Design a protein around this ligand. Sequence first.
Ligand SMILES: Nc1ncnc2c1ncn2[C@@H]1O[C@H](COP(=O)(O)OP(=O)(O)OP(=O)(O)O)[C@@H](O)[C@H]1O
Ligand SMILES: Nc1ncnc2c1ncn2[C@@H]1O[C@H](COP(=O)(O)OP(=O)(O)OP(=O)(O)O)[C@@H](O)[C@H]1O
Ligand SMILES: [Mg+2]
Ligand SMILES: [Mg+2]
Lengths: 391, 50, 889, 413, 239
Amino acid sequence: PLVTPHTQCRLKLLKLERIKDYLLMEEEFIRNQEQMKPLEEKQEEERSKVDDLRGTPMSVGTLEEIIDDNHAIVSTSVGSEHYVSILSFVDKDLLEPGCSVLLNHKVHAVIGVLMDDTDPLVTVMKVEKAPQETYADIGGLDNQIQEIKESVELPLTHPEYYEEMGIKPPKGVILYGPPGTGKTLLAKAVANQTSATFLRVVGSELIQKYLGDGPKLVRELFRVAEEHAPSIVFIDEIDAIGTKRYDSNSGGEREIQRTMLELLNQLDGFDSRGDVKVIMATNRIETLDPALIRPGRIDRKIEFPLPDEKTKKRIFQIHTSRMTLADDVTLDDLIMAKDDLSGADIKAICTEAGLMALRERRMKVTNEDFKKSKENVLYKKQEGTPEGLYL
Amino acid sequence: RLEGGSGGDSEVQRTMLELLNQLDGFEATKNIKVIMATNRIDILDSALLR
Amino acid sequence: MEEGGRDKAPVQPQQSPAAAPGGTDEKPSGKERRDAGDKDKEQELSEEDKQLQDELEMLVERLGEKDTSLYRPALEELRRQIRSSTTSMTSVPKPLKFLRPHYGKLKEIYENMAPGENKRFAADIISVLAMTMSGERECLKYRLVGSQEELASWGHEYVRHLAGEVAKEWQELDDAEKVQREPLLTLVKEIVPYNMAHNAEHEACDLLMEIEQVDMLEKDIDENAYAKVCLYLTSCVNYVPEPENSALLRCALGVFRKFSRFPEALRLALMLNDMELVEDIFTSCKDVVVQKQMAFMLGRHGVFLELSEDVEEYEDLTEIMSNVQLNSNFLALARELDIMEPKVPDDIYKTHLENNRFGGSGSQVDSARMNLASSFVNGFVNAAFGQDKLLTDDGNKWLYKNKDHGMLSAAASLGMILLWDVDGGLTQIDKYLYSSEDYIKSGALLACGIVNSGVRNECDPALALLSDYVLHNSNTMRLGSIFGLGLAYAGSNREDVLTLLLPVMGDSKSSMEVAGVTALACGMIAVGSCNGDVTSTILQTIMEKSETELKDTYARWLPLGLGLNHLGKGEAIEAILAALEVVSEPFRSFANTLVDVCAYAGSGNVLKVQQLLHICSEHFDSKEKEEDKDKKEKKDKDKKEAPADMGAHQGVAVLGIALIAMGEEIGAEMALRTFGHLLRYGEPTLRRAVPLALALISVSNPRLNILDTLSKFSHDADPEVSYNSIFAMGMVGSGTNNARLAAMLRQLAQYHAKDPNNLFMVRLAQGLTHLGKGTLTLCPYHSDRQLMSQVAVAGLLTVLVSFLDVRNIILGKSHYVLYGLVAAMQPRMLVTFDEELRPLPVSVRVGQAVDVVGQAGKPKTITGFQTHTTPVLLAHGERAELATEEFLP
Amino acid sequence: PIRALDEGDIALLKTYGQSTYSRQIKQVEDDIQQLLKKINELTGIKESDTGLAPPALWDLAADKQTLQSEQPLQVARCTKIINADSEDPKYIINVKQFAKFVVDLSDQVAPTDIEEGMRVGVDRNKYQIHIPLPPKIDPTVTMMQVEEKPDVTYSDVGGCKEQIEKLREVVETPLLHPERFVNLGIEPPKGVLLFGPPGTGKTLCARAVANRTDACFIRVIGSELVQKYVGEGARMVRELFEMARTKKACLIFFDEIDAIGGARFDDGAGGDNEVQRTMLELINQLDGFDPRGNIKVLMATNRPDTLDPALMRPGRLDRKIEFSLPDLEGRTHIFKIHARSMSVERDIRFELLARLCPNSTGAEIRSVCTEAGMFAIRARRKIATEKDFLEAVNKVIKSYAKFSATPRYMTYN
Amino acid sequence: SYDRAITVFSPDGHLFQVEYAQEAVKKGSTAVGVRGRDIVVLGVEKKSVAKLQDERTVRKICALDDNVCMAFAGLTADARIVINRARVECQSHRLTVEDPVTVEYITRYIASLKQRYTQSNGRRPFGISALIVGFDFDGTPRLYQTDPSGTYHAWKANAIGRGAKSVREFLEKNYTDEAIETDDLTIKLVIKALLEVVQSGGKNIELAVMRRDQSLKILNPEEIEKYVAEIEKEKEENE
Ligand SMILES: Nc1ncnc2c1ncn2[C@@H]1O[C@H](COP(=O)(O)OP(=O)(O)OP(=O)(O)O)[C@@H](O)[C@H]1O
Ligand SMILES: Nc1ncnc2c1ncn2[C@@H]1O[C@H](COP(=O)(O)OP(=O)(O)OP(=O)(O)O)[C@@H](O)[C@H]1O
Ligand SMILES: [Mg+2]
Ligand SMILES: [Mg+2]
């Protein structure tokens, strides 16, 4: 992530060709690795007959009980239960009733044991790519940047400060405020610069219709996070997961309400938690369940207000990084004159003014682009609130 | 987004939050464009109008 | 689509150049005046860079391309003025008249005759007219001429001054970030004759500006971070005179032309050392120019400042040599007893207290080889004045109890207790010296070289350890006497005691470990001349190693001093010297990869890195040259630790996947010493990737291979929270990972991270990036650990006192003459700023705020405020001078 | 009158401004991302190795014995027996998934141990009984028998000197002195509900009695009772209330019984039907015919209003212990619990801190104790001062509890 | 939850409908005021003329009696009732007791009239806050303030309206214990205080002073422009 000239300079032509040099050599070295292998023994006769000892259509079974005389009991998908033996090379030390095993068809015998057993709905929510830029991307939020770093990055990088006072770091963080402020950016910048793994949850993702399929996916969600790295979990748009826990008349409302009541249990209920951090985000905060807002579950409440006349300069500066800017413009024209508008408004102004230059056959962008752009973006919010009663 | 209680609707919002997020979530999409067309400008929600 | 009605320019400049063949002949006025009316108007519709779409420039050539093909050549009677009207008007649209094979024909309109002073109609326009087109000429057209035929025709002759005025024009129009476009122009034009381009561009820059020097100045050294061998040879000496001739910032000479010492010429920086002795005004920049000249990148400068001004202007030499060294001892004496440290912490051993209740009871460990590691509760914590009377009683009993190699080891630990000392360091040894034993005196008098290491004053050039050496008829008196004095005089390149200790090589007394460390002792001294050392080593090498096919005591020690005597030059003559000198059998051609890449400390020479892979890649090699592919991988570890992190991410990407993943003896035995050589800072990417292959011990091999990778997993200094890994692996490492072999090792790894509180700079990077070797003192240890049987007998000479080039730590002191000032310094996560808006904010981590001797840390360019001007060298370097000035109200 | 695009004017744009390095820098970035892919499929080192033992021990088995245990070994199934008839086998056997057969015994059996309701190994071809089995134990109650001590002493539940006193009477005292109840002529209650505001200490009292129990203790995961299949959740209730009768005096802790049924209604003809069957099965094995004897039930909820009056009846839930907020003497004891194990100044007072938390819980008090040390890491300290706690009270409470009453305060002094 | 009544209490003892009346004060234009040695001064901001109206009917500064002033915030309707009522009491006091009316007596009337106006249901309280400045009580300069709860209170320098928290924090670091004599210096303190306006247009400041012996002296936008010039003269010392 070092393309730091950020412009059409020969350094970025030199830097990226260095990256081309190392990856081509990494290709050619592993190309030589699968090339110059004159070693063939292929099992030394042991695993080769074993791979022929097991059946070729390997099937999947489920343990019920363990009769340890090398003759145990299993269960199939339909529930057909078979007094099968243990055809060998399996240590009887990691097989428990519930752990799924590997079976045959002709004799149904236990050949291996199936590992990791993840239902392929939680593996979709496992992020592999760092999407965007680092903390230097966003346009100045440094009082609240230092807050989230105290609970996520700093306890993982340097947990020597906390043992000197015996204080565990905070676990839950709420991001709340008006829309268009930077909630989704602050999660993506953390997921960029991190060392542990990352999990994203899009709102109504853990909602199904089979009346028990809802809460069952939540158990496997925290199970995967606990079994893997000391990592964090980002669950966004939790306004569709909690509203004050009232009792009413609809029957599909309860399997909604029950799944959202056992997330409470997995979070800060019985004995332990592990090193799992949870980051949650909404637009509205007052319509939430007060059982989730209490400390023990969430220890940080972070406001994201609409910007000022000072850090707004940093918003216009970053979104006008790589565009040809004519020297006629003043950034403080649109900032000081109008004092209401979000950070997502400013990105729309910079894109619209660039479209106005091609609209009148230009490359550079003058003040007259921003005069028409600041109009056209802002005409989507209504006229006003009350007449001159107050003075 | 109305209130809770036995009023408004949750499930209308449950679908709406996914529309609110598959184009603006953790993963930004490319080469997919949406067109929305309706009257009654002031009564659709101020989270997809941003 | 509102076309039509206002298409004036797609009609009348569609007709009048179409009527130009209708009015060239039989119309002498319409040939000229309509051309001039075409020329100025097409010139006028391009000068505003606020209409890129030109109503002529992509409207006329739809017929005008076939017109110009019949107007410029086919006229054949071109006048003196009509060529200045045709070529001035028709060389403008030719980048967009023509497609991507324009690159051979930017000349069939232009170079018929370049009309006059082409910037006359291209001055105020930035690059739309011809300046992009000028770069298109210097890209392809000049390079095919200047590939072998630089001295050539009009494509070089006028093109020189044509590129001269264009390079002036980049810093003329707007003076924007197109300043850096001039090195984009100067280096593409005549890549190898860059200096022939730069010599005109040096003098042009000298008269260009004195404020718009510095960002182009750092643009050069960013391009000089990696290049070809000849480009790094060329643009670094072009870099030298710009703070010498244009400006006189000039305190960036000494270390930032140590950049240019080894590549261009050793005497050239000595002529720049002469240029240091020219600009002697007045003291403050002069002081900190010569602060680095002793113990920051090299020593050996104490012979050139005893000339005719020996009062205070040349009496800084001994002050540089040992007094500011002793003022640095006054850091560890005064300031570092103040911050943290009483005389004996002695309690990282006591931090193993909670283990005795973890699982019932304790007091089960009684291994005698743990008592080797018991010396490092006293040994490592007592560096920088951890002086101990009767706190060495754990040493004093175990010295007089057993363990002859530990009698040498506990005696060698006394030199680490009194380090950087000349005042009373020998007096501490003398009471613990007279025991009349082989092992006691050979460890203590080797430690005497450690005490006066970095001093290089008159302590014992041949006084003590030469008299220790001539006592030999026997064991380590023969060995341990030559090692300490070459360790003490490693910073020097003195010839005399090298010739005193050359008959150690010429004795042919066949003690093998003595001759091996003899190559290591002479290797630490010199890096340049004295080819007779290369002669002396290979004589006994051909005598001894030819009549054997055996252990690496031959191989790990004897070619290594050859590589240390020829370290750090990418000339590739040293490979022609060494490899054609030891043309021999392949177990002696193990030494082929040593002196090849020891001259290749750090640069971008990726063509070497592929021959560092492709020759001996895998082959599966049934137990014949497996040492050579480890040592070929050993030389992959350097040439990676100083392109400044550009290849470090690529190094951890390749060596994590390729070897430890799809390897064999190369990966699962040896390929973790990269991480024990790449960085010593620590970060949880590689610090957690090593216990992926360590918590999985993979015990089927001789597991001390993987437990060697345990050992220098803790080869990261600057103490951390890594105690969680080592103590928990020490808990599984007591019973399992048996304590007979590595109970010394895990606590060697445990006790080395908290060596002192401070003094962790062992990482070969000073100022910003320069080496300061350094390398000659560390690299013997990672060459030593190949692999086993030196955990017991022979490597105990090495494993304690191998690397001893720690230079101090911290950039907190002020030294304004009385040394009373503290500062207001402001420490931050390091710079990222390369080219952005002026001025550029240097760093990003504003939270930490100290005044005085606080820490260095991994990426810290610590700045200061309160208008003290910090004027000294404006880089940093831990002995700032800090004058005072406030003329801004 | 605004139109500015025509295919010739497209060729104006991508030649003006850095024609040298535009594609020259771009395709280098393009093919390296192609090369990010082409390394990955060239590696292909996924390696999901599992099932295999260390390959130094099974060598004796997979020489001939594995081939000897293919054809002579049997793939026999297990079943259940209804009954038998005299002078003959006449064995009537079901599967509950397959059909019901009437089969013969084999030669390798003793005809005595073919008792009714017994799991037996059954042939695949002629379906003869070969091997009788031990009875089935329920697999998921074994998963939720805790077998583990969470470490919370009663000295950490400060502010609740009387709520523990009520809870000590029901759980601990009949299990250690079952005399004074009989020797006076009373019976202890058998069901205790816990209700009140969240974060008040519901889980702590349940976590602390799991420490000092000396008895069978069963945590019950609440949403395991809700299943996908019809009637499956009601069968899970039964197996729980059978094995409790086997051993003596086992403790069962439910938690958040709001989820497993709160109200019984039917107006839209449907809804939470399967939840009601599991919930009513819980009732009839709580009271009814066959009283349970020595089974103590603990429940805890945050929303006690929305529960069924069938559970509100005493005889099922007998003691209503509620948790309130500690007045002042409770909170001053709570600060001394959560701040004794941290580096503080040894001269500060805590009663001034307990003033400024008027309506607060035990969770909110601990959040102040953790936050005050976080201010010490904002500065560079290793001990907490008085103003560290005073800023922490404004950070936790006053940043969310009041914003109009603090600046415009002048109605009260 | 429970507010919707001025007679009910919260479970933690509050009157939210009284507290909501102070929220209506924060929609008003800011007005500051200090006392000095002899000359008291108060200024208002945010004139914002709208090109088509007469500006002598939008006045925010009035006089109750000959030696007492008034500046307010909130909404314009409720201020007109309080002003017109207070003119009667400061005139009927003079009839019953032949003294002039002190500045302390008229503030207790405004607070007590707003007091009983809060107690009874079906009586919406006044959503205004006022500044009473008068150097009337025997040559002594004083200034008080009010509150919609009905609590009269005395400051030495005051700020109200939309943005009072910045100005009140500004004056604490600016009001010197050195008494601002040479009263144009004290007037320049207010113009420096009103320089932190919501937009600071310069020509939107209506300062009104009183030299404690004459009547009210409304400043013109030529004398006030001279004081804005000398504020930029002292600002030239930053370079
Ligand atoms: N402080 C900021 N600096 C720079 N860019 C910003 C900032 N705030 C918002 N943006 C812009 O806003 C976009 C991100 O939207 P944001 O993170 O505000 O969504 P959100 O808060 O999740 O909105 P919603 O709550 O409606 O889902 C980015 O494209 C970014 O360019
Ligand atoms: N009386 C108390 N004394 C000491 N600490 C307390 C007390 N009450 C609560 N705490 C602290 O508050 C934290 C959270 O309390 P807990 O979650 O047990 O409350 P709860 O009532 O069980 O919550 P819920 O009703 O949501 O289940 C506990 O970890 C405990 O440290
Ligand atoms: Mg969002
Ligand atoms: Mg609880």
